[PDB]
């Protein structure tokens, strides 16, 4: 059913700041229900009409959307605390985001996990999709890991709490589609979704790099997509090319992304090469 | 005309030791010349014969070889020192060698030199073949850098000046012609291999071939084929000539005079033929197309 908790100030406590975004600022902080006793570790967002013009005293029904959905690979909602500002509640994850993860351990990973996490961030994505729920934001920021070996989307729908601003960069993500005419759907998310593998198999790299933001739309335009990872095969790298095929009824839903990552993960290095030592060995 | 000087114990004085190596050990010392007045900043390379059977009290016409080289891109060999150990004597270079060099730099290097270095080490070379003086060892801890822009060939012929003991090699065979290394085969064109591995660590930025291979398999994969993989910042172009360097086939392989060509003309447009990442990553690929 569509629902979603809502919290009391009094119950939500801040202790430290995490960092802020793109719109809204995290925090670390516990949660004291009204039995008073024990602090429950939790991470709460806060978001706000930037221009002081209209406040978050209302819930509407795009939260209760955001606010029931539950599924293994998301961050779920545990709640919303409405006020001036509005504080998105979920669990803490002191695993941080899968990006500063892959940076900070590179092809050490497993490039079994480097396949399990394309499968586990599809099957999220596709729960979402099957509940008509865009994201707007997916990204390997805005990916976090709770086991280990298991990751969750998180962010998401938070864009659609907001009035248009395309003036704050998250364009780096975006289909070509929702940059030229704020058009935003699943097929556009599909984009994101292949910028964010690109992210993974990179190791953590910006994409367009030393390039200018205004460049990317033309160049993009003109068909010249991100290049091929030095661990992918090319089969890892042509689901990526499809993610961002220029037509949305073209690119592939997460179920066919779900499928092939899961078989890819059959064999990992068959379809993933994780330099055992500059390159080598070449006919 | 072929001659060399003899150094005497007396004007060469060693003060502190560089490294060792394949056959010798480097010092940095300097030189006295008999004025006694000041003292030259010098390179002795001690050479023995390790099982300490044979002296070298007697120069050889090798020696001599070695002794009379002189070309722009080459360590010239100042002198010799006769004894119980040999004691080669050429000019100190502060700058170290070019390989630890293109480590401590990397891609900043201007793409402008990555290909004058390529071009510098092929004349050497090809001055050697020119004289008949085949190298044995060359590679990039054997090439020295004299101005921040210009190298040298270094520790040329100094193989020939020992008994063949194939077991002490522990490298150099990583760098040796197939033929080399089955049949101490040793020629112009065996050099011609070595210069390519060496390109390759050149453009590799300093990348130890075969990094985490077995010794003993570098023959049998070379063998069947396998040559070592293109470095991350060379064209198609610049990668093919070390690809004929590895010809199987001696007389295949590219005189340096060729090799020198290449490179010189490959100079006139340096980002044309070498990639350098301005970022970290890969980046604006040529939009591919699936199929259904
Ligand atoms: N459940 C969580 N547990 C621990 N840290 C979290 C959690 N959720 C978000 N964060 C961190 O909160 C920080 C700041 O919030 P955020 O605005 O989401 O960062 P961000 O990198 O800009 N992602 P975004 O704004 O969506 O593009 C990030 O660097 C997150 O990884
Ligand atoms: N003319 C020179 N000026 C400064 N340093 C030098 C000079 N010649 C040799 N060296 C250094 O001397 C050290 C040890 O001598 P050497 O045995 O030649 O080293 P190496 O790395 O093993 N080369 P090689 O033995 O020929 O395979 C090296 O690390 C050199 O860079
Ligand atoms: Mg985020
Ligand atoms: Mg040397």
Request: glycine share 8%; net charge neutral.
């Amino acid at each position: 059913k569509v629902l979603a908790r809502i919290f009391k100030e009094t119950e939500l406590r801040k202790l430290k700041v995490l960092g802020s975004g793109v719109f809204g600022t995290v925090h670390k902080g516990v949660w004291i229900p009204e039995g008073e006793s024990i602090k429950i570790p939790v991470c709460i967002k806060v978001i706000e009409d930037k221009s002081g013009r209209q406040s978050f005293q209302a819930v509407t029904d795009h939260m209760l959307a955001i606010g029931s959905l539950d599924h293994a690979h998301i961050v779920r909602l545990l709640g919303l605390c409405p006020g001036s500002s509005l504080q998105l509640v979920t669990q803490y994850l002191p695993l941080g985001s899968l990006l500063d993860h892959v940076r900070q351990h590179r092809g050490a990973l497993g490039p079994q996990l480097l396949l399990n996490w394309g499968v586990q961030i599809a099957k999220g994505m596709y729960y979402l999709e099957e509940h008509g729920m865009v994201h707007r934001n997916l990204a390997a920021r805005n990916v976090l890991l709770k086991s280990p070996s298991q990751v969750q989307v998180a962010d998401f729908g938070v864009a659609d709490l907001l009035p248009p601003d395309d003036k704050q960069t998250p364009i780096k993500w975006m289909a070509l589609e929702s940059i030229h005419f704020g058009k935003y759907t699943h097929q556009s998310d599909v984009w994101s979704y292949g910028v964010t593998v690109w992210e993974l198999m990179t190791f953590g790299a910006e994409p367009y790099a030393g390039l200018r933001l205004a460049e990317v739309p033309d160049l993009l335009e003109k068909g010249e997509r991100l290049a091929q990872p030095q661990i992918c095969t090319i089969d890892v790298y042509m689901v990526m090319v499809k993610c961002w095929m220029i037509d949305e009824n073209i690119r592939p839903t997460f179920k066919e992304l779900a499928n092939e990552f899961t078989r890819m993960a059959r064999d990992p290095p068959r379809y993933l090469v994780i330099k055992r030592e500059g390159p080598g060995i070449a006919p």
